[PDB]
Structures are given as C-alpha cells and as structure tokens.
Amino acid sequence: MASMERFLSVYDEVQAFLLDQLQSKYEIDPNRARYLRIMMDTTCLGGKYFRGMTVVNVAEGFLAVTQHDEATKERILHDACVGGWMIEFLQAHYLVEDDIMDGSVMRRGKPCWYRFPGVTTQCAINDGIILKSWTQIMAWHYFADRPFLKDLLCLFQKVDYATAVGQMYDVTSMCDSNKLDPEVAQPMTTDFAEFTPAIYKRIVKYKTTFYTYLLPLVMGLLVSEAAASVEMNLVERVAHLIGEYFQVQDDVMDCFTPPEQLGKVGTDIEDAKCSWLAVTFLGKANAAQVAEFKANYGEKDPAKVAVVKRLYSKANLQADFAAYEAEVVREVESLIEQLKVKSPTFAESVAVVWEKTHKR
Amino acid sequence: MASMERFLSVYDEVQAFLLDQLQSKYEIDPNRARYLRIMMDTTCLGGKYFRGMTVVNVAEGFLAVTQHDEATKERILHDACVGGWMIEFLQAHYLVEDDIMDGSVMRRGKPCWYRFPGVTTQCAINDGIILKSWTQIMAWHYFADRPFLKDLLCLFQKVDYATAVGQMYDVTSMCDSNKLDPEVAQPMTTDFAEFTPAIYKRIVKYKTTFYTYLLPLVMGLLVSEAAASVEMNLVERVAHLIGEYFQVQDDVMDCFTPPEQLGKVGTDIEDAKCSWLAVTFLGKANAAQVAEFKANYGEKDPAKVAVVKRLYSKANLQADFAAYEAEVVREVESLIEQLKVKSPTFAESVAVVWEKTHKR
Numbered sequence: 001m002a003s004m005e006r007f008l009s010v011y012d013e014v015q016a017f018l019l020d021q022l023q024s025k026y027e028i029d030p031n032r033a034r035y036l037r038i039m040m041d042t043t044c045l046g047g048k049y050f051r052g053m054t055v056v057n058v059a060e061g062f063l064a065v066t067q068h069d070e071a072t073k074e075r076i077l078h079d080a081c082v083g084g085w086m087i088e089f090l091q092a093h094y095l096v097e098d099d100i101m102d103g104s105v106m107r108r109g110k111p112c113w114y115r116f117p118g119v120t121t122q123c124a125i126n127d128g129i130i131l132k133s134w135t136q137i138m139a140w141h142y143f144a145d146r147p148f149l150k151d152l153l154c155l156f157q158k159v160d161y162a163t164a165v166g167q168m169y170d171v172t173s174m175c176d177s178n179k180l181d182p183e184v185a186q187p188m189t190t191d192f193a194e195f196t197p198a199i200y201k202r203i204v205k206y207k208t209t210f211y212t213y214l215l216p217l218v219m220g221l222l223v224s225e226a227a228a229s230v231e232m233n234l235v236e237r238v239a240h241l242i243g244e245y246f247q248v249q250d251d252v253m254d255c256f257t258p259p260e261q262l263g264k265v266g267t268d269i270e271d272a273k274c275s276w277l278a279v280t281f282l283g284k285a286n287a288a289q290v291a292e293f294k295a296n297y298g299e300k301d302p303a304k305v306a307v308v309k310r311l312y313s314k315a316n317l318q319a320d321f322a323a324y325e326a327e328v329v330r331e332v333e334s335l336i337e338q339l340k341v342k343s344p345t346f347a348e349s350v351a352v353v354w355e356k357t358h359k360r
Numbered sequence: 361m362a363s364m365e366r367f368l369s370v371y372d373e374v375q376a377f378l379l380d381q382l383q384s385k386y387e388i389d390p391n392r393a394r395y396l397r398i399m400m401d402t403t404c405l406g407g408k409y410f411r412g413m414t415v416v417n418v419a420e421g422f423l424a425v426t427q428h429d430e431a432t433k434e435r436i437l438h439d440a441c442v443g444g445w446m447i448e449f450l451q452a453h454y455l456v457e458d459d460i461m462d463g464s465v466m467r468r469g470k471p472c473w474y475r476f477p478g479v480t481t482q483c484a485i486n487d488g489i490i491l492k493s494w495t496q497i498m499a500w501h502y503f504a505d506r507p508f509l510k511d512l513l514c515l516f517q518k519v520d521y522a523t524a525v526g527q528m529y530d531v532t533s534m535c536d537s538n539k540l541d542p543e544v545a546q547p548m549t550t551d552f553a554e555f556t557p558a559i560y561k562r563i564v565k566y567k568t569t570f571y572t573y574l575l576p577l578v579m580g581l582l583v584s585e586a587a588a589s590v591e592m593n594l595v596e597r598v599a600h601l602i603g604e605y606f607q608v609q610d611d612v613m614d615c616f617t618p619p620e621q622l623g624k625v626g627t628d629i630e631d632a633k634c635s636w637l638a639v640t641f642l643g644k645a646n647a648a649q650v651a652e653f654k655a656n657y658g659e660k661d662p663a664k665v666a667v668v669k670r671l672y673s674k675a676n677l678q679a680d681f682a683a684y685e686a687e688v689v690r691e692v693e694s695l696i697e698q699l700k701v702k703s704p705t706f707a708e709s710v711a712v713v714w715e716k717t718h719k720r
C-alpha cells in the first residue's frame with residue numbers, strides 16, 4: 001500500500017474513533033459531533049502533510065533494512081501514521097490559535113477558522129484546545145501497550161512547550177525587552193537593537209523547528225525503535241538548521257510572493273515582525289537607509305509598507321539570500337555525512353526532508 | 361508542617377524550577393522570564409486553592425492510617441502538592457482562555473489577564489497555552505520515576521479533554537442544536553426547548569465537575585497508591601453530584617450576589633446562558649411568564665435583564681433551590697456511606713469536600 005493513501009486512511013480511522021468516543025463516553029449529540037467533524041477537517045486537512053508524512057517516511061526507511069513479520073511492518077506503519085496525525089493536529093492547534101492571536105484573515109486561500117460565520121472566536125479558541133487534546137487521546141488509545149509510549153509523550157510534550165515559548169518570542173519580537181511589563185502597554189521598538197541574527201535564530205528555532213523538523217524525525221525513530229541508530233545531538237542540529245532555512249524562505253515569501261500564490265496577504269512589515277529581510281537589511285544599510293526603515297516599518301499605511309519593500313529591493317537581499325542558502329547547503333550536507341556513519345538509512349530520510357525544503 | 365504552607369512552598373519551588381529551566385534550556389532572557397513569573401502569579405494565585413489542597417487533604421488522610429518512613433511521608437506530601445498545582449495551573453489555563461472567549465471583564469475583583477495593558481489577547485491566548493504546558497512539565501520532572509506517572513498523566517489528559525468538551529457544551533447552550541453549522545452565524549434559540557435539566561446536567565458535568573472534584577479526589581488516591589481503597593464508579597458519582605451542586609450555587613450567585621462580593625458583574629442573563637435559574641423557571645412558569653422570559657432573555661438592555669430577574673424572584677426559585685439542596689444532601693450522604701465500607705478515610709475526605717462546598 002502507498003504511503004499517502006495509508007496516511008489518509010488512518011485520518012478517517014482516527015476521526016471515526018474520536019467522534020464515536022465522543023458519543024459513547026462524552027454524551028455528545030449528533031449536531032455537535034458534526035460541528036467537530038467539520039472543524040477537524042477544516043483545520044487539519046488540505047496542506048501537504050509534510051510533517052505527518054515525514055514520520056511515515058522515516059519509518060518506511062527503517063522497514064526496508066530491518067527484519068520483521070508482515071503484521072509488524074503493518075503495525076509500525078499504522079503507528080507512524082497515527083504519530084504523523086498527532087503532529088498534524090498539533091500544527092492545526094497552533095494555526096487556529098495563532099490566526100486568532102494575530103488577527104489573521106486567510107490561511108491556504110480560505111478564511112481562518114475563527115472567521116467562519118458559525119464559529120467565532122468564542123468557539124474557535126476552544127476548538128484549538130480540543131485539537132491539541134485530541135493528540136493526547138490518539139496517543140493513549142493507539143500506543144497504550146507500546147514500549148515507546150513514554151518517550152513519545154515526553155518528546156511531544158517538550159516540543160509543544162518549546163513551540164509555545166517560540167510563539168511568545170515571536171509576538172514580543174518588536175518590543176524592547178527591557179520594557180516588557182504586564183502592567184504597561186507595549187510600544188514598538190524605535191531602535192530595532194533586538195533585530196539581530198542571534199535573536200531571530202532564537203525565535204525561529206522555538207516557534208517552528210521543534211514541531212516541523214525535530215518532532216517528525218524523532219517520532220519516526222521512536223515508532224521504529226531505532227533511536228539508537230542515531231546520535232540525538234546530530235539530529236537536533238540538523239533539524240534546527242533545516243528549520244531555520246525553512247523560515248527564512250517563509251519570511252521572504254511573506255513580503256515578495258503574490259498574495260493569491262502565498263494563500264495569504266502578508267503583513268510582516270505592518271506587524272513589525274523580526275523577519276530575516278529586516279535583520280539582513282539592518283545588517284548592511286547605511287545611516288540614511290536605517291532612518292528610512294525606522295520611519296516606515298510596522299505601520300498599516302500602504303505607502304509606508306511600499307517604502308520598506310522598496311528599501312529591501314535596492315538592498316539586494318536576494319544576493320544575501322543566495323549566500324545564506326549556500327552556507328546552509330554546505331552545513332546540511334556536512335550533517336548528513338556525519339549521520340551516514342550510524343545510519344545511512346536515517347541519513348537518507350534527512351536528505352529527503354532537506355530536498356523537500358530546499359526545492360519548494 | 362501545616363498543609364497550606366507546604367502547598368505554598370511548593371508553588372515557589374515549582375516556579376523557580378520552571379523559570380530556571382526556561383533560562384537553562386529555552387534560551388529565555390530575564391525580562392521575558394519576569395513576564396512569565398508575573399503571569400503565573402497573576403493567573404494561578406489568590407484563590408482558595410480548593411482543588412489543589414483537596415489532593416493534599418486526601419493524601420494526608422491516607423498518611424494517618426498507613427505505615428511509612430518519615431522520608432516517604434514527605435515525598436507523598438510533596439507529590440500531593442505538585443499534583444495539586446497541576447490542577448491549579450489547569451484551572452488557570454481554562455480561566456485565562458474562558459475570559460478571552462467570553463469577553464469577560466473582571467475575575468476575583470481584578471481585570472481578566474488579557475485586559476492588562478501589557479498583555480493583550482495576542483499574548484494572553486498563548487499565556488494560557490503555556491499555563492497548561494507547565495502542568496506537563498511539572499509531571500514529567502517531579503514524577504519521572506513514580507509508579508503512578510502513567511495513570512496520573514492518563515487521568516489528567518481525560519479530565520482536560522472532558523473540560524474542553526464541556527466548554528463547547530456551555531458556549532453553544534443558547535443555540536438550537538439542529539442549527540449548529542460552521543458556515544452559518546448562529547441565532548439564539550427562540551423556543552428554549554434545550555433548556556432542560558438533563559441538558560444542563562451535561563454542561564455542568566463536563567465543564568466543571570471533572571477538574572474541580574473528580575481530578576483532585578483521584579489524584580489524591582494516585583499519589584497515595586490507594587486507588588484500590590475505593591470503587592472508582594462511586595468516586596465518579598459522588599464527584600459528579602457534588603460538582604453539579606457547586607455549579608447550581610455558582611449560577612444562582614451570578615444573578616443574585618452583589619457584584620463587589622461576587623468579584624464579578626454577572627452576565628448569564630445577557631449571555632443567554634443555560635443556567636439552573638432559567639431551567640427551573642421554565643420548569644414551573646405559566647404561558648404568560650414563559651412569553652415574558654422569551655421577550656427579555658439574552659439581551660444587553662438593563663431593563664430586560666431586570667425583567668428576567670423580576671420573573672425569577674416571583675417564581676420563588678429559592679424554594680426550588682432548598683428542595684434541590686435537600687435532595688443533594690441526601691444523595692451525598694448515601695454515597696459517603698457507600699464509600700465508608702472500603703475506606704472510612706477516603707469517605708471522610710469526601711465529607712470534607714462536601715462540607716466546603718455546601719457551606720461556602
């Protein structure tokens with residue numbers, strides 16, 4: 001059976017399981033079950049399933065080189081799918097809540113969930129809660145007797161936490177740290193002294209890399225009982241490097257990809273986000289250019305946004321981007337080589353993850 | 361050492377642990393650590409710690425009748441405190457997010473967290489996420505080698521889920537079920553056919569009783585390794601009964617307790633909530649009175665709210681309340697007796713929980 005169709009079958013299974021359990025144990029009625037079904041589909045489906053499918057991919061790599069009964073190959077692949085959906089549902093949680101937090105309008109060419117007329121923020125915040133609660137319901141049900149249950153739950157838990165810490169780093173990235181104070185409304189930075197490479201790296205490391213690259217890789221190892229085929233410090237490094245690159249692309253796109261293609265009208269300039277463009281701009285701008293940036297960044301006014309965009313074009317940031325990209329290629333290749341020593345198989349799965357990121 | 365001061369010491373310990381770990385492992389800076397410290401204090405402290413202290417109370421009951429080394433008595437009490445704070449932090453999560461969802465103004469005589477000037481909803485939603493993530497960080501750290509870890513995590517997880525399911529039942533309680541639809545903005549019910557005792561019971565059972573009464577009771581059993589001193593079906597029943605009573609008091613107070621004493625301006629009438637007053641009103645009203653209720657319920661207009669309040673007074677709902685109260689006393693007493701057969705000790709802890717609820 002092909003991987004994607006397995007993964008999709010498992011979604012239907014897990015959905016039926018969750019909703020049947022709501023009826024049998026949580027006294028749900030059919031209309032609220034239907035609400036929850038449509039919520040799950042709307043918030044969890046229609047992406048590429050990169051994250052979830054990486055768990056499957058890593059597991060399939062191990063299957064090709066490890067002796068097992070047929071029934072065992074099926075159980076490991078089922079487990080990789082369940083694990084993958086846990087990650088997809090965890091992403092869904094974060095997208096729901098993030099869209100609410102940021103006042104976002106569209107996601108993937110459709111309205112954000114909270115903007116559906118029969119949802120509202122009042123419901124959507126709780127829907128997002130339920131999304132994440134479902135990951136735990138899946139794990140305890142499907143992995144109950146599994147030897148990896150504890151390590152998988154513990155991993156999941158620390159990635160979830162890292163992610164929430166990252167969202168805090170992200171939403172506070174345009175304030176001056178020394179002025180954070182729950183009692184005082186927060187001004188936007190005027191000096192941009194915290195728009196640095198190291199600060200940027202911290203945001204991206206926590207907000208995206210743990211759930212997008214580390215969790216799918218390591219879940220794949222855990223469902224395969226293969227976490228001793230690898231040096232976990234090397235897996236973390238490679239996950240953090242690739243994930244950083246991913247976000248650097250995401251930041252460039254937010255500014256320069258046409259809305260209809262991006263699935264989104266990008267607002268990072270208006271939201272005064274610590275983006276890779278802003279940091280790299282401030283890394284090479286002269287005094288005049290910096291002053292112009294400060295007078296126009298983080299403002300709704302489309303004239304001001306078009307000034308900041310003009311500044312970025314004339315700063316030849318694509319040349320800085322090529323250069324970053326070259327360095328990441330080289331470092332990713334070095335880490336893959338290091339991984340080849342213990343597991344050529346796992347190294348190849350990392351190679352695939354990198355090709356998919358690097359090409360998209 | 362007295363229980364409350366143990367419990368409070370443990371808060372300071374757990375706080376220091378969480379924030380030190382943010383600095384050592386999550387690259388946090390001191391100002392964001394300070395934000396998070398003040399968030400934790402503001403959202404987790406200043407209540408009565410009923411829930412958290414029930415874990416301690418149950419554990420202390422078992423200590424009085426079980427042979428143990430001194431060091432073991434201290435470890436079980438430490439564990440009961442950690443467990444108790446998990447519940448308190450879980451409540452804190454739900455209050456933060458609930459206040460945002462419901463557009464609430466005050467909580468305990470202070471502004472809701474999201475309303476602090478330097479917080480905002482954008483941050484507060486994520487703060488609430490972090491609150492709940494901290495419960496898992498505590499559990500894995502403090503209970504890592506404990507035999508009850510799995511059962512405690514599994515229990516916690518199903519209570520958290522039940523709670524979120526209950527919030528969905530609550531916020532949708534004024535819509536007609538057959539009209540729920542993410543695509544269609546939701547009208548308030550005109551018939552109030554879903555304002556029934558059984559529907560009310562379902563809301564309250566899920567939204568409050570699992571985290572307020574069941575979780576503290578059963579956590580106390582688990583940290584004491586005493587879950588075989590009891591018939592778990594009886595613990596659930598008694599928890600659901602007392603919890604229902606608790607909420608019935610909460611609903612009456614929302615209408616009739618002066619704001620400054622309630623720590624809150626109650627808005628259940630305006631929010632068209634399925635409250636015990638509304639259900640009991642509609643259970644005894646004549647046609648004229650029902651028509652007057654339908655013309656005035658769920659409306660911001662203070663004249664209309666004062667009409668619904670007038671209807672409730674002249675319907676002599678305090679007499680219905682006395683009668684409910686009498687029935688609950690009798691049923692709670694029956695369950696306590698049933699519990700006395702296996703554990704007089706646990707029965708007494710339940711007796712205390714009931715006295716604290718019944719008297720407040």
Ligand SMILES: O=C(Nc1ccc(F)cc1)Nc1cccc(O)c1
Pocket residue numbers: 196197198200201275276279280320323324325327
């Ligand atoms: O190492 C880089 N970091 C980076 C990451 C994030 C950020 F915000 C700014 C810069 N850039 C780089 C580019 C070309 C060559 C090179 O040896 C290094």
Ligand SMILES: O=C(Nc1ccc(F)cc1)Nc1cccc(O)c1
Pocket residue numbers: 556557558560561635636639640680683684685687
């Ligand atoms: O059993 C009751 N349930 C209840 C709970 C919730 C609700 F919404 C409405 C009613 N009430 C009751 C009161 C006096 C005597 C009695 O034998 C029963």
Ligand SMILES: [Zn+2]
Pocket residue numbers: 098099101102170
């Ligand atoms: Zn965001």
Ligand SMILES: [Zn+2]
Pocket residue numbers: 250251253254
């Ligand atoms: Zn972007």
Ligand SMILES: [Zn+2]
Pocket residue numbers: 458459461462530
């Ligand atoms: Zn609410």
Ligand SMILES: [Zn+2]
Pocket residue numbers: 610611613614
């Ligand atoms: Zn109330």
